[PDB]
């Protein structure tokens, strides 16, 4: 029965991209800020109320929110963020994809919606562009209109298969 | 955006959950964290401790056990959504969006009590129950009489959902429908219906509404409408009219939404027979 | 040649891989956190208690209430103290000790209400009306004398919220001497000239670092940027501001919120011959930076009411008005969505009133050639107006026999405003060539036709040109990014130094070979074929003491260059009133396209968002003046579902600008044009008319 | 006028306050400390194991042994491993971990030694010896011929090390396009070069920070500089390299080590005909970017072994040799101080052994007019050495009178060295100036002076021109901070462009007022008294279309100009041998003086460090090749205790370098003065002959 009151911080650990970082947190100290200060600020905040998804990691295999998660609660996960797609400067096929089909504008959604991407199509390796929409409508984006991301998503679902 | 500070525990095992939230009125225990942090970080409570259930992972379960389904309170939305519940897996599906459905749990969905939530729809439809446990032991309700009003489940200090309980409706029809503006929205209106069929007739028929009232209701009267009928289009017309008796919705507008209540009951009827 | 290829993004690799470089990822040594206490009251008297880490508007601006108010405030939203604290979630608790005392007092939040000057909006003005101007032009006597019919209506264009995914932001940072100060700004050279202005000293460096969109929302520098600014030189740390998001919706990006009150003149065949009324904008609070912005476009709205088409005459009582709200700015369009959305929406409600097909009524009263001079004195300088249209039937008979309902309009629009623009290109002795910007792209991807124009001009390969922007100690100076200027003027600015450029590595060339070609950067005796490489002409030009770092100025002497197009939309409309938009075409003539995958995915991100202008968004207000939509869930900008199974777009080169680009501005069109095509192709299915957006679900069942 | 005005520091400001920021203080996201394994044996080959966080040279130049050792280590302190970690403190904890695998081989520390080629200090040499030319000029054989006397002697000037209280020190980011490396250096442009050079592509922004100090440390780029600049390319983190001191002791700064065999011929009256001998330089390890450095300096040393002197013939045979230690660097005067220290001392070895005062000497032997060309090919451009001289004398008559041993020494330098330099100025809308200098100031104050000299020329207030210098993005390019030529060289295209700048603002002006007078930045016409100030002259500029940002290169086509003084010590020595300063003059002739308070301030640094040489300082090896000074404790740089209790700085002005400026370089000239002028006091106290530096305490007991 580990208990932490309001004014001690706890040490943490998280393994993001691979690797293992250790930090003191106090309880109430969300996951997006935490992956911010140690340095991933590809991770972005867009929003206050869990809608937009920029702040979108793949946390233990899954695709979450970071901006909802504690990152006490966090402590022992495994954490990818786009920062680590790429493999030794090749670009991983959705990024590539993104690139080729315009997908980004400003690059602020981009980090996230990418990750939600790479999420997606390991649930669904041949998705329709109706699973494809579903499937991103946890991220937003105010510039591209989506229908290009749509566009880079089935080129790398071929790219992937 | 920022919570307030507040306190955190992370017990060892069930049984100390338990105690510190018997003997700390005010602490939060923590799920999936997608109702409970949203709140934190608008400064609508304010606990002394959030205490962190999450890594009880014998509460995250789906167990068919006769004709019950078993499900632990700590199962999250996207693995409901892949287990062929009848009814109750295309309701969980629809909740949210993919980032929201991977943390979410039942559990903290019935515990928290949106009058606009998906699964109220589903799982009044269904007579589910609720396994709520003490160190005091196991008390099992009927999803009914849990669902005390907006917000405000039957949960004492002390005690924590651990199972929802359903029946298994093999070869019944279903269909979840979900008025919504944007993909990942709450309900504007939510109908979730169950029909079997012995022939051409109705055998049964549960209509579940949610977003429409304080808590969810059956929608009695379209359920009279076609129980033991033989189905053709002008009961079905006539069901989805009276199902609009059992909402009493707020201002989309009140007017708007009553009138939402047929048609997505007319769709309800006609997908699930399709 | 690089120019008109769809060249893909050079800015995207640092972004796609998480290594951009946004305000909030900036820290310096000691940066505190600051966070702006907002009023809860439309209108009231304030006192509030300075006390540690409480700072007031008397510490900003004593003596009056902008940017930050010191004794009245006139909108919720607005900044009435700041606090400073060591990081953003203790500054968010300090938020919660700040004491403030307010008497409430009397507020209006209809403009129409507030022209009557009954309450002020502001103790202190002589009116809430801040321009009132009567816009005539042709005949309108005439054109009321000759028409069979007249037919009214008031048409509201209706507030919407920017929202950029990244807020505004800023960090500051005063040395003794200089102001270094970071914002998510659309100019770095704009937003130092207005901190100069307010501050009262020269030395400011400005850093635009990535900038996750603005779409007008980022023109006008802030009240909160103001006084982290001011701030800044007082407490000698680095000072980093950040709202939440629920801060912005209530504080920035506001804009639209236009009403017509409208008479038309018709001929019983589908002639349109003139208009009258009265057009009421709401500019909400009186704050200085925002009420000049958005008064400008005011006038946009007015200028472009005659749109494409033949109109004899016109008669507009134009007010922009005070009310008790966040003060109103440009969004995308600046105006012209408004103008041309009430032209649009005018010109179908005659079809549908005189039975006339709305196509044929568009081909009956365009403009035939341009250049042509609008009624109310806009020049549209180049193209063909009919000729498009008719390139566009081709698609709305295609989408007359789809299932669905068909709406259609078509723009004109102004880009491309001055007074000029800057470029530097520079060369190092290595070789190494940079190309600065004074524009200040944010999202829209001029960099990279930046790098096609001065690759094409030196005869280099693309990646040979490092495209830079955003720092006022980079380049002399600069405009900036809006007013959909940025390829054409910044382009144009571009094409001249890259120009000079080769200018200068010819005779530097011609000097080592005695004489007076150029090809690929080397430049060789034209006969007897001694050749000088670019490398041996730039280690020359640097021995000679001649330098290759060249600054251009584009001055802007013509007036805005004129695109124009038409859009299309086939929708559905279902049982429980949601609409389902199927297709929607776009034709545009943006003069020469320097890079259509870049131009479409600007007409495509502008597309959608005035489709959520018609179809989802807007700003309103309970009736004690609390805006009701504060965050995503509750303003709703279209995910991926809500968008156009497909949209299809074309261009046609008709009409260049006068600039040596050739090119018209497309970061605004799409926006203009959607919102009335998909309003058009609505009201096809229902079949009431449409006088109020967003279309909501309980209108259309 | 502000030239020749004891100007304050424009620089002091941030630095009192503490808002400096050198490199250090400097942090991005997720930044990752970054230390070297160093050898820990003179000459070895080794093994290293690549580890989790432990790199090798094979990680960085695979299949040679330089920057980074791979098979073979060459010196104690050579880097032979990179380890990475979270932190400094890990960091360290991480060294100890490394594995390295050590194969002893035979070493040689002695250059004497080393040139017989018995041991190599790498086993790929051919020879030990990396420069080795006979130096003749004159008619040697005559002076040996009319000579009544010979004296032969071995003169020691030993190694130092700079020890600037700022250690090198770099951050590198690599975002996956373009690196950013910041470095505590003498130049971001000329790091740059080197870094493309390196890593063989073009798209690196350098950024020089505050620099405290470097007195010729940081002129080439470190190993480690190399290494840090390679893994980031790889790493796509930020990675932060700071040496503890211990490191940085035995591995940079390490400077003059050199050795002069002689024999003088001279007449009995004290006329120095000729001279003849052997000088031995120790490069230390075959570095390149160091043994270039230092064998060019090798060659300044011989070059100014005539002085000032009117010498017949000589004829000396000169090595640079490597040994196995810490490659030898450039360190403040770069060989002018050894050669001039070489013949200040023989000079008074000579008047010592003749019975003439040392004063008389220089008086007999001296030049007489300039222009004069030495014996090896130095053009000793203007000024008259004789008449500073006749000056001097009357201090030396003053010093001759009090308590104490007078030594005197006279010297003539080299400075301003080419090739080029740039000069970027430029003024925004609202009339702000920014001037930026291609040199790259760390501690020197020429940002003043340059400040000084645009001002004159534009007739504004001083405050109004900003400089900046230290990022490749800000300016063309440049050439760096060394060889005493920034005020100089860098001061003369700093006037070039604002020259530029005064001209364009006159043709504006002129345009503005129909015709073809200036004061004051303001424009008036010369009767009819029309005149536009200098804020409306540069709005017009911009509507017009005219660039107001120039870059000007100065091309040097002079040889390096020459300033020359004499120097004067009076000190006692006490019955522990320890050696007190009383009163030290300098006479300086640098030409034309920009600022009298910052001249005398240099003065005064280099003469502190050229005593120190003299009394304090020397870096040497234990037979192990372990340098036995590796902390402040063991390398006695001087406390404020250990100084001169006056010393008087006057300057003449008799020779103007060819120069616009007119100045010639001071920032070396007290250290090249101050180390033969103290030892000759020494000297006279003691009375033996010094032949080695620095004076023990024993040896003069
Ligand atoms: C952007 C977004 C969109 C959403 N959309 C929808 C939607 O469309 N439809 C919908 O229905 N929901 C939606 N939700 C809500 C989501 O389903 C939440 O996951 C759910 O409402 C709460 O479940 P949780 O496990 O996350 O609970 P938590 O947030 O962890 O807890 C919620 C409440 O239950 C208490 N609690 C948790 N578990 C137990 C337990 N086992 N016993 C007793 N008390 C417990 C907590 O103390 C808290 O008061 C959305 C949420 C977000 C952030
Ligand atoms: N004839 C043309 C016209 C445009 N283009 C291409 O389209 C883009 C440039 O459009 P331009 O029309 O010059 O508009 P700006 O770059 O000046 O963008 C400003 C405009 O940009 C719009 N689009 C936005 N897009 C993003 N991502 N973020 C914002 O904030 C945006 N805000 C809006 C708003 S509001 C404005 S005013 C460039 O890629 C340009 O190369 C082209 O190739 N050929
Ligand atoms: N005729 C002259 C000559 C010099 N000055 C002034 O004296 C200083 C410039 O000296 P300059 O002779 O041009 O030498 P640099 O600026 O090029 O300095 C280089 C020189 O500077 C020296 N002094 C140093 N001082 C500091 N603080 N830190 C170092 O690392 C230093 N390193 C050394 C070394 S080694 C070198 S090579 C400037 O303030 C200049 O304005 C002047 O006013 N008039
Ligand atoms: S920041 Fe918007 S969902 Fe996390
Ligand atoms: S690219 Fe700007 S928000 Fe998506
Ligand atoms: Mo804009
Ligand atoms: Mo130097």
Redesign the interface.
Known sequence: MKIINSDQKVKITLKINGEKYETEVEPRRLLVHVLRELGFTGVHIGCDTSNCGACTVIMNGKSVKSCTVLAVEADGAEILTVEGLAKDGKLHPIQEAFWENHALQCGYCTPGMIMEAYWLLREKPNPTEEEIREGISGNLCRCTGYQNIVKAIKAAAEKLS | ????????????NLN?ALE?LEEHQDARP?AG??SL??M???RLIRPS??V?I?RFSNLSYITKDGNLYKIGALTTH?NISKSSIPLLSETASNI?????R??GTIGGSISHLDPSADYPAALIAMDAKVKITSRKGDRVVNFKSFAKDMFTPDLNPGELVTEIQVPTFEGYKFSYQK?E??????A?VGVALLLKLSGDVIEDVRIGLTAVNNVAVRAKGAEEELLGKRLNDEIIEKAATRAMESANPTS??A??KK??VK??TKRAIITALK | MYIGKPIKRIEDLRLITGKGAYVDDIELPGTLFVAFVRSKYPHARIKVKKEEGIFTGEDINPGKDFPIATKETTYVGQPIAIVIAKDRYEAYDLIESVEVEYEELDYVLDPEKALEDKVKVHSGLSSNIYYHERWKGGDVEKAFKEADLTISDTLINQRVIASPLETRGALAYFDGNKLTFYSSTQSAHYLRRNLVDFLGFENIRVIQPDVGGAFGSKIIAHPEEYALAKLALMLRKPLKWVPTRTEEFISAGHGRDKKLKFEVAVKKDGTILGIRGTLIANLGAPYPDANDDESGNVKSTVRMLPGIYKIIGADIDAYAVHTNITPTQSYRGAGRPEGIYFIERIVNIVADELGIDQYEIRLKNAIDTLPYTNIFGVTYDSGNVKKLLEIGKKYYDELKKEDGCVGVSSYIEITAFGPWEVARISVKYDGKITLVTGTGPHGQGDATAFAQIAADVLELPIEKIEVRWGDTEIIEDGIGTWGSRTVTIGGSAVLLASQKLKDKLIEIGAKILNADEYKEGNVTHKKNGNKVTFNEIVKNAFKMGESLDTTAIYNVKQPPTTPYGVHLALVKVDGTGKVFVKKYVAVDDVGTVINPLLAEGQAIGGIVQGMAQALLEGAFFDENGQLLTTNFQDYPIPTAVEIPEKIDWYYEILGKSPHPTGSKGIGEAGAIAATPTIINAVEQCIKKRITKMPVKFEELV
Not at chain 2, 96 to 100: A, L, M, N
Not at chain 2, 181 to 186: C, L, P, Q, S, T
Request: charged share 25%; hydrophobic share 40%.
């Open positions: 955006m920022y919570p307030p500070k507040f306190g955190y525990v992370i017990p060892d100390e510190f923590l964290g997608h942090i949203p934190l970080k608008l401790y959030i962190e999450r996207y949210g969006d993919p980032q929201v991977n943390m008025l503006r944007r993909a990942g929205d709450f504007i989309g507008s007017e708007y009138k939402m048609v997505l």
